[model samples]
Target: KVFERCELARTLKRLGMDGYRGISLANWMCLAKWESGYNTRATNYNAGDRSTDYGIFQINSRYWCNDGKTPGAVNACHLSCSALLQDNIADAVACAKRVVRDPQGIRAWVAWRNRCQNRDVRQYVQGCGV
Candidate 1:
């Protein structure tokens, strides 16, 4: 769970990343573990791969599917189980920031945890914070 919720505390402080100014690292970690189980290679077969499948963030490959030679909304933003390929902490932190930026306050994380707690459901898309 500490992949970032507890580890990014230092990375963010080192890089001076905003958006997490008042956010609780602990709370984010709670969300992190809930998201990918601290595994950099997290993948989900939501809709039988390619339909609504994804990697770390569980983003559909088709959403950003392309030549896969560059990083853009479809490449970098494109979810894949190879989250470790990116700065594990940075990717994790960025996603977390996006979540907290929303109106939800870790509630989505909690829901994600519950949904995946017992063999992820095909319908549960993990729309998590991180």
Candidate 2:
């Protein structure tokens, strides 16, 4: 599912992502742009270790969700990877909060580290009423 920037912001706001924990909406919005380009069905498989990243947040199968095919998955989110690939993003939001609560914070996502960290992403939500 592809979402317009404002639509995505509205949904994230409804999910309490605007100020969940210490994460800002702009930061997460910036993350969505770099991670999945706001495409909820996005999936990426890294051949190096065969790890899979799913959904708009690109939650990983190795440590977050069960892809069913990945051996020895931890599934900390207790959700199927396919659950992240839908228009409904409640599950993805929940799992992402967990990731942020971890020691690494949002740095768990390389995209966040490389693109969003130490940057002011206010523009990401400039026109989003959320």
Candidate 3:
């Protein structure tokens, strides 16, 4: 499922993404836009370590999930990589929270660091009525 901009905004907001761990909803929106464009089934393979990023937030098998092929990767989130691809984002959101609990916070996402950090991210949630 590929969500419209406003639709995704509302969904994330409803799922407790607004102001989660000092990260704003718009920042999450900005991350999703760059990472997977709100698509539930997005996947990216990284040959560097044979890991894959899955779903809207691009949770990775290298650390967050168990794909059974990411070398010595550990599943800190204790979830299968396929869980991140589901249309329902509950598991993804929960795993994302776990990632943020690290000292990195939202910086766990490289896209968030390069794109959302220090930028005017307000535009992502603009006019979404979120």
Residue pairs clashing, model 1: 5-29, 55-80, 64-74
Q: Specify the highest-lDDT model's number.
A: 3
Per-residue error for 115 in candidate 2, Å, reads 0.8
Q: Which ten residues in a row have the lowest lDDT in candidate 1?
A: 121-130
Candidate 3 lDDT by residue in tens digits, 13-129: 988989999999999999999999899899999988798999999999988999998898999999999999999999999998899989999998999989899999888888999
Any idea what lDDT model 3 has? Answer: 0.92
Of the candidates numbered 1 and 3, which has the greater lDDT value? 3
- Candidate 2 lDDT over 1-130, as tens digits, reads 9989989998999999977778899999999999999999999998877789999999999999998877677899889999999899999999999888889888899999899999888988998787
lDDT of 1 by residue, 24-103 (tens): 43333333355565545555544433343222333334433333433342533433424423544565445445444556
Tell me which of candidates 2 and 3 scores higher on lDDT. 3
Whole-model Cα lDDT of every candidate shown, in order: 0.42, 0.91, 0.92
